[PDB]
Design a protein around this ligand. Structure first.
Ligand SMILES: [Ca+2]
Ligand code: NA
Ligand code: NA
Length: 714
């Protein structure tokens, strides 16, 4: 029983291998209460296959094992730095090789060798001292335009994707797809105006061959690729080697990642780490350490499983401190600015709340968010409050993604690809309004800061591709490309002016695609050739698009699928529509940052200040429609208004006497541009007798500045 094991062996002392005396000594502590013996196997720093020696540990308090390696070793080592190790643990006459769960770095890891021998089944840890690596001045972000969670603008990027486009090889001075190559494209992000860059999992993950990390994955593939998003966790303190200049040097990834974080900070941004504590890649990672303990279990003690590995049981004392120690070590070592929890609804609320508190005590401006789906499994017959969307009414700490706004604007599970608000499918106007004020309909958000507002992310089809599928129009036709971009800008404007915390998938700003443009796949292929995780996109007549296969889950896809396209993102001669959308997103960000009208800090303040103008059923607005219009009274007394016409015809928005004051407003966004300065000659708008008319697929934002108003009418 894990609960009984806790009463008898709950240990709160230090764990891991602490490299001491400029490398002359190492102190080792492992928790393994059921072990009969525990030795450390030391592998050579130059040839990790070679065992240099094995040293017995001795029993310590509360189920731990401990040893000091020093001067007096007969390993022939005078500096331990860079040597590798595993624990050899004996139980009931059986011996296993286990990974130190508190390993601070690792040997280059290649899962294609995992069957060779027991020493290859899991990574080997490295003795390293992170404090002495990287910029010694690294500290927490001083993040521009940011005071509290509602002021964050999050940008979700995978480290490889962000510099894996062969088109930028000419400009890169560091190995593509690494932490230091990422630095070289940071100015684009500073210029975009985002506040926090959320990176896909940088902690060590299992299914990958890090020895091929400099190889270009240039053939289209959507399965069996060396590429990995990283959701197959191996260790919660060590960085993967996949984004390192040299995976074989266990200190380099740490220095390089410190350098990356410091450069993000120098540019006035912060870093958020995607972390995957909900499950490990392999049951044995932790079962080999202590049997029938670390994972959520059936009543008989069988480890419960998720994504092919063990569900970590964060209610259990040593699993709880694994999560918490990991969060603290990552904040203090790498000075990050927040975390995004994967499958956060799998965890007990108490763990997630305690991680938040611990992290904030180190970095008082740190923020968190997570996938709050209702997914809790836990221990059999041990119901527990989970850190899911229903936790939001009980806490004002960690936010959750809002599937209500994503689904209602452009579809999501179940029902992916069904027309929705920006894709030709009428939706309940009050449901759209409530979402835009950070009041989703599927959970109770009693703070706009509880709500991460988004329409695209790394999973599912990209905003560009899901729009193309939904409206059923082939982007290879110029007029359809333009239309898709109109709809993408409208969706982006809805999110960037919504209450709550907006979240931007890397590439959403320009209309990134995951179309499987393999020359052999121009037209539909035989069923046994169909690319894994694809949809075959069709026009309204049911004709395939040109290159009809689009990847909707690119977790196991090559760079040809996953690269961020820098030519579409930045070369406005070659791709004027994409760059126009990018610049539309930059301006929308600048618009949001210019006023706190779009980022009110309480529910009560949103109730007082935000009012629906397009009342469903009145004045040409149907109960369910593809238009919406609303007003905000900003805290300084200025009046903003957002109007969206997602119909394929011109639509009128009725102002009457109640909203007549919007007639002498500056236009901050129109069909071409967005930003904080009034647009000289606004396009797509027409003032009429009843109010305001927008062109088809057009959105606008208005501002009335009280400093230009009458002294007498008052
Ligand atoms: Ca893969
Ligand atoms: Na999708
Ligand atoms: Na996208």
């Amino acid at each position: 029983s894990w609960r009984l094991k806790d009463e008898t062996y709950s240990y709160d002392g230090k764990l891991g291998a602490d490299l001491k005396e400029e490398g002359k000594q190492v102190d080792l502590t492992l928790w393994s209460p059921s072990a009969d013996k525990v030795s450390v196997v030391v592998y050579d720093k130059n040839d990790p296959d070679k065992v240099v020696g094995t040293v017995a540990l001795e029993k310590g308090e509360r189920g731990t094992w401990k040893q000091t390696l020093d001067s007096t070793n007969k390993l022939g080592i005078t500096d331990f730095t860079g040597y590798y190790y595993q624990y050899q643990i004996e139980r009931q006459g059986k011996t296993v090789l286990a990974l130190d769960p508190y390993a601070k770095s690792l040997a280059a890891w290649n899962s294609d060798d995992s069957k060779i021998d027991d020493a290859h089944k899991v990574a080997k840890a490295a003795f390293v001292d992170p404090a002495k690596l990287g910029p010694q001045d690294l500290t927490y972000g001083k993040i521009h335009n940011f005071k509290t969670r509602e002021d964050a603008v999050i940008y979700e990027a995978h480290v490889r994707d962000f510099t894996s486009d062969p088109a930028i090889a000419k400009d890169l001075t560091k190995p593509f797809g690494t932490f230091e190559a990422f630095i070289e494209k940071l100015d684009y992000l500073k210029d975009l105006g985002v506040t926090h860059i959320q990176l896909l999992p940088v902690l060590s993950y299992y299914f990958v061959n890090e020895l091929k990390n400099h190889e270009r994955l240039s053939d289209y593939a959507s399965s069996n690729s060396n590429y990995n998003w990283g959701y197959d966790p191996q260790n919660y303190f060590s960085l993967t080697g996949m984004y390192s200049s040299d995976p074989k040097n266990p200190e380099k990834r740490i220095a390089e990642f410190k350098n990356l974080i410091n450069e993000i900070h120098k540019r006035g941004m912060g870093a958020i780490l995607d972390v995957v504590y909900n499950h490990t890649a392999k049951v044995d990672l932790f079962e080999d350490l202590e049997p029938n303990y670390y994972h959520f279990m059936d009543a008989d003690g069988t480890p419960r499983t998720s994504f092919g590995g063990g569900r970590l049981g964060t209610t259990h004392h040593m699993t709880k401190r694994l999560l918490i120690d990991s969060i603290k070590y990552l904040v203090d070592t790498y000075k990050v600015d927040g975390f995004r929890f994967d499958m956060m609804g799998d965890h007990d609320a108490a763990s997630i709340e305690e991680a938040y508190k611990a992290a904030r005590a180190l970095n008082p401006n740190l923020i968190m968010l997570g996938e709050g789906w209702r997914t809790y499994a836990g221990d059999e017959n041990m119901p527990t409050k989970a850190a899911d969307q229903d936790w939001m009414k009980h806490t004002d700490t960690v936010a959750v993604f809002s599937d209500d706004i994503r689904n209602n604007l452009k579809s999501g599970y179940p029902n992916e690809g069904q027309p929705a608000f920006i894709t030709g499918g009428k939706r309940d106007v009050n449901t759209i309004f409530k979402n835009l004020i950070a009041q989703p309909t599927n959970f109770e958000a009693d703070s706009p800061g509880d709500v991460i507002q988004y329409i695209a992310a790394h999973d599912n089809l990209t905003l560009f591709d899901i729009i193309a599928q939904s409206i059923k129009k082939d982007p290879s036709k110029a007029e359809n490309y333009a239309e898709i971009h109109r709809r993408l800008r409208l969706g982006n404007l809805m999110v960037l002016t919504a209450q709550g915390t907006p979240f931007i998938h890397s590439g959403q700003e320009y209309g990134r695609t995951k179309q499987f443009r393999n020359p052999a796949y121009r037209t539909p292929v035989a069923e046994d050739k169909v690319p894994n995780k694809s949809h075959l996109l069709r026009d309204k007549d049911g004709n395939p698009f040109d290159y009809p296969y689009f990847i909707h889950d690119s977790y196991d896809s090559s760079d040809a699928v996953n690269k961020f396209d820098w030519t579409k993102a930045t070369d406005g001669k070659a791709y004027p529509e994409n760059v126009k959308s990018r610049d539309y997103m930059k301006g929308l960000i600048a618009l949001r940052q210019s006023t706190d009208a779009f980022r009110l800090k309480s529910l009560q303040d949103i109730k007082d200040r935000v009012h629906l103008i397009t009342v469903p059923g009145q004045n040409g607005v149907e109960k369910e429609d593809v238009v919406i219009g609303y007003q905000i009274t900003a805290p300084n007394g200025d009046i903003y208004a957002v109007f969206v016409n997602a119909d394929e015809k011109a639509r009128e928005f009725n102002l009457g006497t109640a909203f007549a004051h919007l007639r002498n407003a500056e236009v901050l966004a129109d069909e071409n541009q967005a930003g904080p300065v009034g647009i000289a000659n606004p396009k797509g708008l027409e003032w009429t007798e009843k109010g305001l008319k927008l062109n088809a697929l057009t959105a606008t934002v208005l501002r009335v500045s009280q400093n230009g108003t009458s002294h007498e009418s008052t």
